[PDB]
Amino acid sequence: SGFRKMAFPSGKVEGCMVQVTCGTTTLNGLWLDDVVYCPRHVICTSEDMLNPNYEDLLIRKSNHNFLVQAGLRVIGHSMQNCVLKLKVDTANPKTPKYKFVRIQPGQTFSVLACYNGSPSGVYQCAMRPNFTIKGSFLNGSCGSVGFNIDYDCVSFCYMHHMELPTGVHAGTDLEGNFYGPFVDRQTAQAAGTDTTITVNVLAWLYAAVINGDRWFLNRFTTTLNDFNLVAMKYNYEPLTQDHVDILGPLSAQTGIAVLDMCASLKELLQNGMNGRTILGSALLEDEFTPFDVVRQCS
Amino acid sequence: SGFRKMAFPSGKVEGCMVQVTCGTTTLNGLWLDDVVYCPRHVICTSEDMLNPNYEDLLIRKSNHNFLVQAGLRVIGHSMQNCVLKLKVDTANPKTPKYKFVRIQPGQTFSVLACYNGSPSGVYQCAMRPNFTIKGSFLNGSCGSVGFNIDYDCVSFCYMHHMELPTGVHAGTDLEGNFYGPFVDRQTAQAAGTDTTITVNVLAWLYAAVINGDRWFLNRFTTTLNDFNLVAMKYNYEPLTQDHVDILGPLSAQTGIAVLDMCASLKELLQNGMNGRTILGSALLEDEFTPFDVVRQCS
Numbered sequence A, B: 001s002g003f004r005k006m007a008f009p010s011g012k013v014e015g016c017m018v019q020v021t022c023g024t025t026t027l028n029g030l031w032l033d034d035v036v037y038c039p040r041h042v043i044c045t046s047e048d049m050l051n052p053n054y055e056d057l058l059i060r061k062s063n064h065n066f067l068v069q070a071g072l073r074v075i076g077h078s079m080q081n082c083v084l085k086l087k088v089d090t091a092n093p094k095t096p097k098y099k100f101v102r103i104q105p106g107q108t109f110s111v112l113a114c115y116n117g118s119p120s121g122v123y124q125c126a127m128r129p130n131f132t133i134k135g136s137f138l139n140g141s142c143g144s145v146g147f148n149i150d151y152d153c154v155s156f157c158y159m160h161h162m163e164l165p166t167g168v169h170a171g172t173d174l175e176g177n178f179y180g181p182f183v184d185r186q187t188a189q190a191a192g193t194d195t196t197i198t199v200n201v202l203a204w205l206y207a208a209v210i211n212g213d214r215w216f217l218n219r220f221t222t223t224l225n226d227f228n229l230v231a232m233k234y235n236y237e238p239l240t241q242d243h244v245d246i247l248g249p250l251s252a253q254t255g256i257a258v259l260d261m262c263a264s265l266k267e268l269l270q271n272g273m274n275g276r277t278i279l280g281s282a283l284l285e286d287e288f289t290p291f292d293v294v295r296q297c298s
Helices: A054-060 A199-209 A224-233 A241-246 A248-254 A258-271 A292-298 B052-058 B196-208 B225-231 B241-247 B247-253 B258-271 B290-297
Strands: A017-022 A025-032 A035-039 A066-071 A074-080 A083-088 A098-099 A108-115 A118-126 A144-148 A153-163 A170-171 B017-023 B025-032 B036-038 B068-069 B074-080 B081-090 B098-099 B108-115 B118-126 B143-151 B151-163 B169-172
Touching: A017 A035, A017 A118, A035 A153, A054 A074, A054 A224, A066 A074, A066 A083, A074 B258, A083 B052, A108 A153, A144 B025, A170 B108, A199 A248, A199 A258, A199 A292, A241 A248, A248 A258, A258 B241, B017 B036, B017 B118, B052 B074, B068 B074, B068 B081, B108 B151, B196 B241, B196 B258, B196 B290, B241 B247, B247 B258, B247 B290
Parallel strands: A098 A153, B098 B151
Antiparallel strands: A017 A025, A017 A066, A025 A035, A035 A083, A074 A083, A108 A118, A108 A144, A144 A153, A153 A170, B017 B025, B017 B068, B025 B036, B036 B081, B074 B081, B108 B118, B108 B143, B143 B151, B151 B169
16 A cells, blocks of 8 residues: 555666757757757847747858767757757667657656766656646756656657746647647746646545545535536536546446545535645645556556 | 655656565565565464564565566565564665664655555655654555655655554664654554644745745744744744754845744744634645755745
């Protein structure tokens, strides 16, 4: 027993991390086969960032303007949305089986935080409903990636680009499309309103029951519609029958019906914990998906 | 910015994990050079565990009684305290630069949770003052290891053996010596009284200030002796001048004197948070060492 925020083993991704330098800027790149992927803002100076014409700035750059270090001669350079793709003369012999996926809000992934092409740590993040993540990133961490491992395949889903002034993080998929409304320009930007990921809080209450914390259970049940009236008041996402179906494996492992767990969540929202804790927390946790609970508890 | 519980990159350790089976029992082993290390209780049946004479049980075993799978012929077997060392016919070609260290209570490490010799996840643990850890381990996770990475060397410090009925975990160093009073016998055992790791809570308050949470700061200071009268009342470890010295780098990064931070901790202990949070927590966190904060924030 025990329930912890757990990252995927990072070995397969560690062998893909390289350092990319353009001008005075140094950040990380992801080396897969003979291509190094990194944030396109690596080509910008601070003055360029105020109003960058990335097409014109990329035209001015040549292959020799990119210094790529793995522990690599750049033979081509191109841009795909907000990512730069540097074709190199050597295929990464450590390239794992991989896919690029654009993940949905509410889903989790592991981040391999890197500096100067060297991995420093690994931790889990959820993609918030407002398309930000709450991670740990300093200057130089750009190009660090988020991923999931499914069977024997690394699914890359995130590349780091920036921190918003609210202290949350933003970036793109590996095709260079930002998650959320964000742009790679030095202009005022703000994330939209966030909400709590209801299906994840229910998954974490199931994790709590599996791991011996049951005090919040009650004899009551609710309808999906009545629960959603409370979710709205507390800025929790509406729960759908699809969310109920996704929680099915947890309902079977514990024998507790999803709508019965919804009545527990209703009481916690309205009354709080009265000084008690759930899995070592005094607040409700929403960064574990139902699959995260199933995989960890199985 | 941002502050997260971060594990070390696990690649170097992933290549060392193997599966060890003896009789009906399957657990994990650590393969370094031509030796596989695992918990000696792998040789016991459930009846043997009630009162095992490990010396006699090991004498009855032969090399062919151990099935070692990496993804290995056992040519020798011996016991060192509570670890079994299976000499194998093949040196691990993925053996990293490593050391075996016995860590001190209050220190942290990364755990690579494994099942059937396959890594499943990685997360940080602190060795509690009562020599237990609060992890996530199921049946089959025995032999999973804890480690730190220092420069380019893996320092192994923990091997998993058991869960106590309070839901906390216990194990040994890589020389087979248990942390704490625990024994590998099926007899009633209980951890001693735990306490909160004061120097770690102060490190996490410094992490909070570095990351923008400053509401708990006040104009007051305390003496080390006056602070320790409050620490005693709240079951916090006494703070020493050595702890004050260890916090020096954090005091320099923030410009906040250690005894000034001790006055903040005193107010939090006596009055609580009044519904506020620190780094996304409604409780005081003690599983980050001062070095964990320095390495993550630098």
